[PDB]
């Protein structure tokens, strides 16, 4: 009942929304959360994604290839059910690990665990789904 995101995780989610808006997408999907995690730069998830080889430009391009893009949106937009499930799962992972704060690493763990959705399609297309998981797992050791 006291589940809470770290500041970096909150920033990543804000960036996910900002990315969707930029692309004229009114629904924030797993792909936007993934791009938000990369754009956040500082957290484990960004360091994992960059280590396995993604750039912001690549992810954005793939999102556009798959979904298209429309004019920028200025009003409020919303999380898809899968995005909501991913965020709920990130809390579940943090509680399983008995950690107080849901970080970027927990959100990326949850994206991978969820297994479906555009973010996983992009990881799979790039051939780095299991490599991303491995890198995330070692980056969470200590
Ligand atoms: Mg964090």
PDB file of C-alpha atoms and ligand atoms in Angstrom:
ATOM      1  CA  UNK A   1       0.000   0.000   0.000  1.00  0.00           C
ATOM      2  CA  UNK A   2       3.057   2.319   0.110  1.00  0.00           C
ATOM      3  CA  UNK A   3       4.311   1.343  -3.371  1.00  0.00           C
ATOM      4  CA  UNK A   4       6.271   4.187  -4.908  1.00  0.00           C
ATOM      5  CA  UNK A   5       8.451   4.925  -7.948  1.00  0.00           C
ATOM      6  CA  UNK A   6      11.945   6.426  -7.725  1.00  0.00           C
ATOM      7  CA  UNK A   7      12.390   9.935  -9.166  1.00  0.00           C
ATOM      8  CA  UNK A   8      14.229   8.457 -12.174  1.00  0.00           C
ATOM      9  CA  UNK A   9      11.315   6.034 -12.804  1.00  0.00           C
ATOM     10  CA  UNK A  10       8.800   8.882 -12.587  1.00  0.00           C
ATOM     11  CA  UNK A  11      10.954  10.795 -15.116  1.00  0.00           C
ATOM     12  CA  UNK A  12      11.005   7.830 -17.460  1.00  0.00           C
ATOM     13  CA  UNK A  13       7.183   7.567 -17.356  1.00  0.00           C
ATOM     14  CA  UNK A  14       6.858  11.357 -18.012  1.00  0.00           C
ATOM     15  CA  UNK A  15       9.195  10.896 -20.993  1.00  0.00           C
ATOM     16  CA  UNK A  16       7.014   8.019 -22.237  1.00  0.00           C
ATOM     17  CA  UNK A  17       4.034  10.385 -22.292  1.00  0.00           C
ATOM     18  CA  UNK A  18       6.106  13.159 -23.929  1.00  0.00           C
ATOM     19  CA  UNK A  19       7.249  10.743 -26.624  1.00  0.00           C
ATOM     20  CA  UNK A  20       3.711   9.547 -27.425  1.00  0.00           C
ATOM     21  CA  UNK A  21       2.526  13.134 -27.701  1.00  0.00           C
ATOM     22  CA  UNK A  22       5.453  14.011 -29.988  1.00  0.00           C
ATOM     23  CA  UNK A  23       4.484  11.166 -32.332  1.00  0.00           C
ATOM     24  CA  UNK A  24       0.757  12.073 -32.352  1.00  0.00           C
ATOM     25  CA  UNK A  25      -0.062   8.926 -30.323  1.00  0.00           C
ATOM     26  CA  UNK A  26      -2.858   9.394 -27.757  1.00  0.00           C
ATOM     27  CA  UNK A  27      -2.278   6.039 -26.063  1.00  0.00           C
ATOM     28  CA  UNK A  28       0.954   5.325 -24.158  1.00  0.00           C
ATOM     29  CA  UNK A  29       1.954   1.701 -24.897  1.00  0.00           C
ATOM     30  CA  UNK A  30       4.860  -0.481 -23.772  1.00  0.00           C
ATOM     31  CA  UNK A  31       6.937   0.874 -26.666  1.00  0.00           C
ATOM     32  CA  UNK A  32       6.667   4.408 -25.325  1.00  0.00           C
ATOM     33  CA  UNK A  33       7.609   3.303 -21.806  1.00  0.00           C
ATOM     34  CA  UNK A  34      10.660   1.566 -23.340  1.00  0.00           C
ATOM     35  CA  UNK A  35      11.607   4.770 -25.182  1.00  0.00           C
ATOM     36  CA  UNK A  36      10.936   6.749 -21.991  1.00  0.00           C
ATOM     37  CA  UNK A  37      13.351   4.460 -20.070  1.00  0.00           C
ATOM     38  CA  UNK A  38      16.059   5.025 -22.709  1.00  0.00           C
ATOM     39  CA  UNK A  39      15.535   8.778 -22.839  1.00  0.00           C
ATOM     40  CA  UNK A  40      15.775   8.978 -19.029  1.00  0.00           C
ATOM     41  CA  UNK A  41      19.525   8.259 -19.549  1.00  0.00           C
ATOM     42  CA  UNK A  42      20.712   7.849 -15.921  1.00  0.00           C
ATOM     43  CA  UNK A  43      18.905   4.754 -14.619  1.00  0.00           C
ATOM     44  CA  UNK A  44      19.764   1.080 -14.861  1.00  0.00           C
ATOM     45  CA  UNK A  45      17.191   0.562 -17.646  1.00  0.00           C
ATOM     46  CA  UNK A  46      18.775   3.252 -19.853  1.00  0.00           C
ATOM     47  CA  UNK A  47      22.268   1.814 -19.168  1.00  0.00           C
ATOM     48  CA  UNK A  48      21.034  -1.736 -20.047  1.00  0.00           C
ATOM     49  CA  UNK A  49      19.312  -0.596 -23.278  1.00  0.00           C
ATOM     50  CA  UNK A  50      22.327   1.446 -24.391  1.00  0.00           C
ATOM     51  CA  UNK A  51      24.698  -1.407 -23.478  1.00  0.00           C
ATOM     52  CA  UNK A  52      22.854  -3.901 -25.693  1.00  0.00           C
ATOM     53  CA  UNK A  53      22.860  -1.329 -28.515  1.00  0.00           C
ATOM     54  CA  UNK A  54      19.674   0.780 -28.717  1.00  0.00           C
ATOM     55  CA  UNK A  55      19.643   4.515 -29.350  1.00  0.00           C
ATOM     56  CA  UNK A  56      16.714   6.886 -29.016  1.00  0.00           C
ATOM     57  CA  UNK A  57      16.729   7.411 -32.815  1.00  0.00           C
ATOM     58  CA  UNK A  58      16.547   3.665 -33.500  1.00  0.00           C
ATOM     59  CA  UNK A  59      13.643   3.045 -31.100  1.00  0.00           C
ATOM     60  CA  UNK A  60      11.704   6.041 -32.372  1.00  0.00           C
ATOM     61  CA  UNK A  61      12.243   4.977 -36.000  1.00  0.00           C
ATOM     62  CA  UNK A  62      10.976   1.453 -35.248  1.00  0.00           C
ATOM     63  CA  UNK A  63       7.948   2.828 -33.430  1.00  0.00           C
ATOM     64  CA  UNK A  64       7.131   5.027 -36.443  1.00  0.00           C
ATOM     65  CA  UNK A  65       7.702   2.090 -38.866  1.00  0.00           C
ATOM     66  CA  UNK A  66       5.163   0.063 -36.919  1.00  0.00           C
ATOM     67  CA  UNK A  67       2.572   2.584 -35.772  1.00  0.00           C
ATOM     68  CA  UNK A  68       3.019   5.604 -38.018  1.00  0.00           C
ATOM     69  CA  UNK A  69       3.091   9.173 -36.721  1.00  0.00           C
ATOM     70  CA  UNK A  70       0.579  12.016 -36.642  1.00  0.00           C
ATOM     71  CA  UNK A  71       0.643  15.667 -35.605  1.00  0.00           C
ATOM     72  CA  UNK A  72       1.778  16.615 -32.071  1.00  0.00           C
ATOM     73  CA  UNK A  73      -0.863  16.342 -29.336  1.00  0.00           C
ATOM     74  CA  UNK A  74      -1.120  19.079 -26.710  1.00  0.00           C
ATOM     75  CA  UNK A  75      -3.956  17.732 -24.505  1.00  0.00           C
ATOM     76  CA  UNK A  76      -3.851  14.781 -22.036  1.00  0.00           C
ATOM     77  CA  UNK A  77      -3.424  11.218 -23.263  1.00  0.00           C
ATOM     78  CA  UNK A  78      -3.679   7.812 -21.438  1.00  0.00           C
ATOM     79  CA  UNK A  79      -1.966   4.529 -20.557  1.00  0.00           C
ATOM     80  CA  UNK A  80      -3.053   1.394 -22.387  1.00  0.00           C
ATOM     81  CA  UNK A  81      -4.106  -1.683 -20.299  1.00  0.00           C
ATOM     82  CA  UNK A  82      -0.750  -3.285 -21.038  1.00  0.00           C
ATOM     83  CA  UNK A  83       1.109  -0.192 -19.808  1.00  0.00           C
ATOM     84  CA  UNK A  84      -0.976  -0.273 -16.646  1.00  0.00           C
ATOM     85  CA  UNK A  85      -0.216  -3.985 -16.215  1.00  0.00           C
ATOM     86  CA  UNK A  86       3.522  -3.318 -16.728  1.00  0.00           C
ATOM     87  CA  UNK A  87       3.502  -0.651 -14.041  1.00  0.00           C
ATOM     88  CA  UNK A  88       1.578  -2.899 -11.636  1.00  0.00           C
ATOM     89  CA  UNK A  89       4.072  -5.676 -12.366  1.00  0.00           C
ATOM     90  CA  UNK A  90       7.035  -3.367 -11.665  1.00  0.00           C
ATOM     91  CA  UNK A  91       5.539  -2.925  -8.130  1.00  0.00           C
ATOM     92  CA  UNK A  92       5.136  -6.675  -7.807  1.00  0.00           C
ATOM     93  CA  UNK A  93       8.815  -7.199  -8.704  1.00  0.00           C
ATOM     94  CA  UNK A  94       9.994  -4.556  -6.207  1.00  0.00           C
ATOM     95  CA  UNK A  95       7.873  -6.165  -3.477  1.00  0.00           C
ATOM     96  CA  UNK A  96       9.165  -9.639  -4.366  1.00  0.00           C
ATOM     97  CA  UNK A  97      12.689  -8.254  -4.030  1.00  0.00           C
ATOM     98  CA  UNK A  98      11.501  -6.506  -0.813  1.00  0.00           C
ATOM     99  CA  UNK A  99      12.828  -3.092  -2.045  1.00  0.00           C
ATOM    100  CA  UNK A 100      11.140   0.168  -1.069  1.00  0.00           C
ATOM    101  CA  UNK A 101      11.323   2.039  -4.332  1.00  0.00           C
ATOM    102  CA  UNK A 102      10.265   0.944  -7.832  1.00  0.00           C
ATOM    103  CA  UNK A 103      13.142   1.890 -10.145  1.00  0.00           C
ATOM    104  CA  UNK A 104      13.744   1.962 -13.887  1.00  0.00           C
ATOM    105  CA  UNK A 105      15.100  -1.599 -13.570  1.00  0.00           C
ATOM    106  CA  UNK A 106      11.755  -2.862 -12.219  1.00  0.00           C
ATOM    107  CA  UNK A 107       9.826  -1.281 -15.098  1.00  0.00           C
ATOM    108  CA  UNK A 108      12.159  -2.854 -17.672  1.00  0.00           C
ATOM    109  CA  UNK A 109      11.911  -6.238 -15.844  1.00  0.00           C
ATOM    110  CA  UNK A 110       8.128  -5.925 -16.110  1.00  0.00           C
ATOM    111  CA  UNK A 111       8.191  -5.025 -19.834  1.00  0.00           C
ATOM    112  CA  UNK A 112      10.220  -8.198 -20.487  1.00  0.00           C
ATOM    113  CA  UNK A 113       8.060 -10.374 -18.234  1.00  0.00           C
ATOM    114  CA  UNK A 114       4.842  -9.143 -19.848  1.00  0.00           C
ATOM    115  CA  UNK A 115       6.241 -10.655 -23.046  1.00  0.00           C
ATOM    116  CA  UNK A 116       3.826  -9.174 -25.602  1.00  0.00           C
ATOM    117  CA  UNK A 117       3.217  -5.674 -26.948  1.00  0.00           C
ATOM    118  CA  UNK A 118       5.221  -3.471 -29.234  1.00  0.00           C
ATOM    119  CA  UNK A 119       8.220  -3.041 -26.890  1.00  0.00           C
ATOM    120  CA  UNK A 120       8.829  -6.816 -26.932  1.00  0.00           C
ATOM    121  CA  UNK A 121       8.292  -6.917 -30.719  1.00  0.00           C
ATOM    122  CA  UNK A 122      11.056  -4.337 -31.061  1.00  0.00           C
ATOM    123  CA  UNK A 123      13.396  -6.222 -28.672  1.00  0.00           C
ATOM    124  CA  UNK A 124      12.683  -9.445 -30.574  1.00  0.00           C
ATOM    125  CA  UNK A 125      13.141  -7.814 -34.001  1.00  0.00           C
ATOM    126  CA  UNK A 126      16.531  -6.499 -32.874  1.00  0.00           C
ATOM    127  CA  UNK A 127      17.390 -10.013 -31.598  1.00  0.00           C
ATOM    128  CA  UNK A 128      18.216  -8.805 -28.093  1.00  0.00           C
ATOM    129  CA  UNK A 129      15.289  -9.826 -25.885  1.00  0.00           C
ATOM    130  CA  UNK A 130      17.247 -12.417 -23.877  1.00  0.00           C
ATOM    131  CA  UNK A 131      20.440 -10.324 -23.979  1.00  0.00           C
ATOM    132  CA  UNK A 132      18.527  -7.371 -22.484  1.00  0.00           C
ATOM    133  CA  UNK A 133      17.240  -9.646 -19.725  1.00  0.00           C
ATOM    134  CA  UNK A 134      20.755 -10.951 -18.988  1.00  0.00           C
ATOM    135  CA  UNK A 135      22.267  -7.435 -18.867  1.00  0.00           C
ATOM    136  CA  UNK A 136      19.416  -6.203 -16.664  1.00  0.00           C
ATOM    137  CA  UNK A 137      19.856  -9.166 -14.339  1.00  0.00           C
ATOM    138  CA  UNK A 138      23.586  -8.612 -13.880  1.00  0.00           C
ATOM    139  CA  UNK A 139      23.044  -4.859 -13.511  1.00  0.00           C
ATOM    140  CA  UNK A 140      20.699  -5.607 -10.621  1.00  0.00           C
ATOM    141  CA  UNK A 141      23.259  -7.753  -8.754  1.00  0.00           C
ATOM    142  CA  UNK A 142      24.947  -6.727  -5.505  1.00  0.00           C
TER     143      UNK A 142
HETATM  144 MG1  LIG B   1      15.726   4.236 -10.564  1.00  0.00          MG
END
